[PDB]
RNA sequence: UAGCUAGUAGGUGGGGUAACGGCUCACCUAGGCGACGAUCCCUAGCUGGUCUGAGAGGAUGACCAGCCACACUGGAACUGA
RNA sequence: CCCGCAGAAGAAGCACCGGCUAACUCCGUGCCAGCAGCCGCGGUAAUACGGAGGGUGCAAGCGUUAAUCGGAAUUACUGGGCGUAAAGCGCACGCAGGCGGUUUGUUAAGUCAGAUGUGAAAUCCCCGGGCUCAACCUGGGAACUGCAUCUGAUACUGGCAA
């Protein structure tokens, strides 16, 4: 099942998430179909800290991809912000 | 046999300059005539002529400045054993641009500078310095 | 307007099949010399019309045998 | 104003009837740091006489080199006997990168920025001869344009 | 030399041969000492050089030079040998590491202690 | 990770004043400056080409109190950067926080400036910076922290900086004890007795 | 290491597979591969890359990611997308 | 991470010093003991062995061993040679192969130009951003020198015709 979720990158104690669309069976940092944004939960002020290509998200969701709950929260927060 | 006639011409130029000959002659061909035009336009030889109809003979008048040969080095690059073709971004420059490289492009034989300015690549006939 | 190859018939002994050589001209990776390389293909020719030496145009299709996966399109200069 | 460097000193022998007679040689290079560089050999029984004979010989037998802002005009190759030398211009601030014998001649001549490499025998005497020969056989845009009967920009 | 000739037979680098095959691409090797003895050197030098015959854990049997002044080694001593050959001593291509399992640091050394396994004097 | 040995020893070996002391005294009245250290100092050295390159590299390193591993990284950065490698290396060395605080005068020596920086007495852009090798940027404002402003060493250091030449590139207000690193210094702003080209070639080897 | 190969090369028909196919079988043709290195023997997981080098190259395939293979040894199927 | 307390208080070693290679004297020993990467040292003045003093190089590391590339143009495509240094078959004919005087036309295979698809992400490179700095992490780009398809050019090379 194609799903949109976060792949954890960065260093110890400083998580950086890559928002990727991928087959649900693969490893978390494993092979992914496409990269659609990034999420930074430690970003300081004046750094965006969250970027999502909403058009690609819409495209993949229209093809039937599911959405991880965390990235669903990100989409709502970004859509609320602007 | 004379497998490389263009090299023969360059060698005649080189040996004639070494021997301080006023002019040199060789059997003609349109490729040789086309290179001789490039040499004349670039000021490495004084002039050239073609003589005869059934067996045309090409004659080049060599060039000296301070009792010294204008052509210091002239070497064949692409040869029948190993052809060399360069793309537009790989066209060599000899002596950091002071000399010329004769390049045969789809629009006739010209210097490397002209071919680079025309955005073409081609076979590299020789380097002249 | 389809992808295709042209080659010469090296053998016609098999029934309904022929082997063609699709020799290509390629530069050597290291030395820079251009060298001829030959590739042999078992090709399918219904009507058993191709004789040795012919120049033929071939196209790639579904596997028709253990070693044969190309089919003849037309003979070029059938003269030998 | 002339700058001089001792490159190599060597002890030679003659093997006379009574035994070995030892004498010394010098190799020196002098230059103005602005395009004139000469080398002298110099041979004597004692090292000071040798270095002095070499310097005097080096002050004469000096040639002029068409430098370009402390850098070579174009890549050049120089070969004397068994030493082959390659020198090419480099950007400002690169330094003089070369073997010891070539280092001295290029420093003293005034080439501030050069990439150099020595192939074949690195015998100091022949390396210096080969690099000086290469530097002399290096022409400039003005002289090449004059030779070719054109202008500089027409050559660029 | 010709490109045609090279295409038919490419240039073929000579394979470098190691000088310490018994080590088998290892920094050190352990072994038991079959015989400890002293042998004479090559022509230019004159001395008694102390060497030991060592059977290594991999089957190889070699002769390893014992550096330093004085050693407490005999048959059945287990030692560590490292690469390196004592030029004027034919056949010897290894050095026993002093301060290893049973080789002991040379007594009363003050300079270059690390090479001879001597702890820092108080 | 630091040179804690005798300071004037280094100046004598290098044959020049390396500014390793405050300057209240003539260095020649403080040591035999024109003689090399040790038992064999009297001998004049006939050092070779590798010798002269090594001595120049050591001089620069001992001036700035930098160890070789860090210094080699500076060369790699300077080589990678666009422009003259030698002048880039000197710009990088000048940009160090310890050198900067010494230049504006909140410290008698680079070691004294280093202790002040190390003991959380220096702020850059209002943030206390404790790292000696911190690289300062143009328009940055380096200030002594409030609690350390009353240090008698800092006051005396300002007076000593008066006698030395004022650096052009950095503007200092002593009353506020704050300075602004206006721009990267050019080569002409730095001492002319540094032969940076020797260092560049020494790493070319 | 110079010859190797009889389901071997191809064809017709039947069966078989999710699917083309000597995948399998019967019959028929006598082919197929090889000096552009077949077959045989030794070594070996492959790649993005890593290290070195001015570059071209050379060595290499730890960590991280993609693909393959294996699961005490040999064989076999069953259940199931 | 910030603040307070106490007190320089709790915190420097390893290799090397004949030449290559930065750094030298004394004492011991006497071809012994030993050193050694190479050349070599040691036989009663040892800057080469052992200790000391002095010094040089690195530094929470410093040396030694192993292993790869470099230097090595010492497999040389870039970029070497073959009279005497290693190296021209004893000579010839000749198949496969490699190479091909000159002119015209055509073709468009090599070649060249453009476009399109792809060349996973990371890594390397450039400009930035975030950890007090750096290592590290991260945004965008360039690159991935390749392959395939399409459209054009006709000098050169190839094919075909004369
Ligand atoms: Mg040599
Ligand atoms: Mg071998
Ligand atoms: Mg450290
Ligand atoms: Mg059927
Ligand atoms: Mg069937
Ligand atoms: Mg099949
Ligand atoms: Mg295996
Ligand atoms: Mg394996
Ligand atoms: Mg190289
Ligand atoms: Mg490999
Ligand atoms: Mg593992
Ligand atoms: Mg399995
Ligand atoms: Mg097991
Ligand atoms: Mg099983
Ligand atoms: Mg199921
Ligand atoms: Mg089933
Ligand atoms: Mg010295
Ligand atoms: Mg020693
Ligand atoms: Mg003595
Ligand atoms: Mg020594
Ligand atoms: Mg000693
Ligand atoms: Mg090694
Ligand atoms: Mg090499
Ligand atoms: Mg040779
Ligand atoms: Mg002989
Ligand atoms: Mg011979
Ligand atoms: Mg003969
Ligand atoms: Mg013959
Ligand atoms: Mg022709
Ligand atoms: Mg032909
Ligand atoms: Mg084409
Ligand atoms: Mg990529
Ligand atoms: Mg930052
Ligand atoms: Mg990045
Ligand atoms: Mg044509
Ligand atoms: Mg043609």
From Swiss-Prot, chain B:
InterPro entries for this protein: Ribosomal_uS8 (IPR000630), Ribosomal_uS8_CS (IPR047863), Ribosomal_uS8_sf (IPR035987)
State whether keyword Zinc applies: no
Q: Which PROSITE patterns match?
A: RIBOSOMAL_S8
- SUPFAM superfamilies this protein is in? Ribosomal protein S8
Q: Name one GO molecular function term.
A: rRNA binding
Give UniProt keywords alphabetically.
Repressor, Ribonucleoprotein, Ribosomal protein, RNA-binding, rRNA-binding, Translation regulation
Pfam families xrefs = Ribosomal_S8 (PF00410)
Q: Name one GO cellular component term.
A: cytoplasm
| GO process terms (BP) | cytoplasmic translation; regulation of mRNA stability; regulation of translation; ribosomal small subunit assembly
Name the domain of life: Bacteria
Give yes or no: UniProt keyword Disulfide bond: no
Query: Function of this protein?
Result: One of the primary rRNA binding proteins, it binds directly to 16S rRNA central domain where it helps coordinate assembly of the platform of the 30S subunit.
Record text on subunit structure and interactions? Part of the 30S ribosomal subunit. Contacts proteins S5 and S12.
Q: What family is it from?
A: Belongs to the universal ribosomal protein uS8 family.
Identification of the protein by name: Small ribosomal subunit protein uS8
The species this protein was found in:
Escherichia coli (strain K12)
Q: Its gene?
A: rpsH
From Swiss-Prot, chain C:
Keyword RNA-binding on entry: yes
Keywords, alphabetical = Antibiotic resistance, Ribonucleoprotein, Ribosomal protein, RNA-binding, rRNA-binding
Q: Name one GO molecular function term.
A: small ribosomal subunit rRNA binding
* Signal peptide positions on this chain: none
The disulfide bridges present are: none
Q: Which CDD domains match?
A: Ribosomal_uS17
Q: What is the effect of changing residue 65 to F?
A: Prevents 30S subunit assembly at 42 degrees Celsius
Q: Does the keyword DNA damage apply?
A: no
Q: Which InterPro entries match?
A: NA-bd_OB-fold, Ribosomal_uS17, Ribosomal_uS17_bact/chlr, Ribosomal_uS17_CS
Listed under GO cellular component are: cytoplasm; cytosolic small ribosomal subunit
PROSITE patterns to which the protein is assigned, alphabetical: RIBOSOMAL_S17 (PS00056)
Q: Name one GO biological process term.
A: response to antibiotic
* The organism's place on the tree of life at top rank: Bacteria
Report the outcome of residue 28 to P.
In neamine-resistant mutant nea301
NCBIfam families (UniProt xref) = PRK05610.1 (NF004123), uS17_bact (TIGR03635)
Q: What else is known?
A: The strain missing both S17 and L29 grows very slowly and has a rather unstable temperature-sensitive phenotype.
HAMAP family given in the database record: Ribosomal_uS17_B (MF_01345_B)
Q: Cite the PANTHER family for this sequence.
A: 40S RIBOSOMAL PROTEIN S11 FAMILY MEMBER, SMALL RIBOSOMAL SUBUNIT PROTEIN US17M
User: What does the subunit comment say?
Assistant: Part of the 30S ribosomal subunit.
**Annotated function:** One of the primary rRNA binding proteins, it binds specifically to the 5'-end of 16S ribosomal RNA. Also plays a role in translational accuracy; neamine-resistant ribosomes show reduced neamine-induced misreading in vitro.
| Sequence similarity | Belongs to the universal ribosomal protein uS17 family.
Q: What is this protein called?
A: Small ribosomal subunit protein uS17
UniProtKB/Swiss-Prot annotation, chain D:
What keywords tag this UniProt record?
Acetylation, Antibiotic resistance, Ribonucleoprotein, Ribosomal protein, RNA-binding, rRNA-binding
Gene Ontology biological process terms from the UniProt entry: cytoplasmic translation; maintenance of translational fidelity; response to antibiotic; ribosomal small subunit assembly; translation
Instruction: Extract the Gene3D superfamilies matched here.
Output: 3.30.160.20, 3.30.230.10
InterPro entries in the cross-refs: Ribosomal_Su5_D2-typ_SF (IPR020568), Ribosomal_uS5 (IPR000851), Ribosomal_uS5_bac-type (IPR005712), Ribosomal_uS5_C (IPR005324), Ribosomal_uS5_N (IPR013810), Ribosomal_uS5_N_CS (IPR018192), Ribsml_uS5_D2-typ_fold_subgr (IPR014721)
- Short name of any one Pfam family annotated for the protein: Ribosomal_S5_C
Keyword hit for Acetylation = yes
Q: Which residues form a coiled coil?
A: none
| A molecular function GO annotation | structural constituent of ribosome
Q: Where would I find the S5 DRBM domain in this sequence?
A: 2-65
Domain of life of the source = Bacteria
Extra remark: Altered uS5 proteins have been identified in a number of mutants. Some mutations in uS5 have been shown to increase translational error frequencies.
* UniProt note: domains: The N-terminal domain interacts with the head of the 30S subunit; the C-terminal domain interacts with the body and contacts protein uS4. The interaction surface between uS4 and uS5 is involved in control of translational fidelity.
Q: What family does the database annotate?
A: Belongs to the universal ribosomal protein uS5 family.
Mind telling me what this protein is named? Small ribosomal subunit protein uS5
**Which gene is this protein's source?**
rpsE
Curated annotation (Swiss-Prot), chain E:
Q: Which Pfam families does the UniProt record give?
A: Ribosom_S12_S23
- Where does it sit, as one GO cellular component term? ribosome
Record-level Gene Ontology MF annotations: misfolded RNA binding; rRNA binding; structural constituent of ribosome; tRNA binding
Does the keyword Cytoplasm feature in the UniProt annotation?
A: no
Q: Name its GO BP terms in alphabetical order.
A: cytoplasmic translation; Group I intron splicing; maintenance of translational fidelity; positive regulation of RNA splicing; response to antibiotic; RNA folding; translation
* Highest taxon in the source lineage: Bacteria
Database matches in InterPro entries: NA-bd_OB-fold, Ribosomal_uS12, Ribosomal_uS12_bac
Which keywords does UniProt give here? Acetylation, Antibiotic resistance, Methylation, Ribonucleoprotein, Ribosomal protein, RNA-binding, rRNA-binding, tRNA-binding
Q: Does the keyword Ribosomal protein apply?
A: yes
Please name the PANTHER family in this protein's record. Answer: 30S RIBOSOMAL PROTEIN S12 FAMILY MEMBER (PTHR11652)
Q: NCBIfam families under this entry? A: rpsL_bact
- Cite the record's note on assembly: Part of the 30S ribosomal subunit. Contacts proteins S8 and S17. Interacts with ArfA. May interact with IF1 in the 30S initiation complex.
- Similarity annotation: Belongs to the universal ribosomal protein uS12 family.
Anything else known:
At least 19 substitutions or deletions in 11 codons can promote streptomycin resistance, dependence or pseudodependence; all but one of the streptomycin resistant mutations (K42R) are associated with hyperaccurate translation and thus reduced translational efficiency.
The name this protein carries in UniProt is: Small ribosomal subunit protein uS12
> What is the originating organism of this protein?
Escherichia coli (strain K12)
Q: Which gene encodes it?
A: rpsL
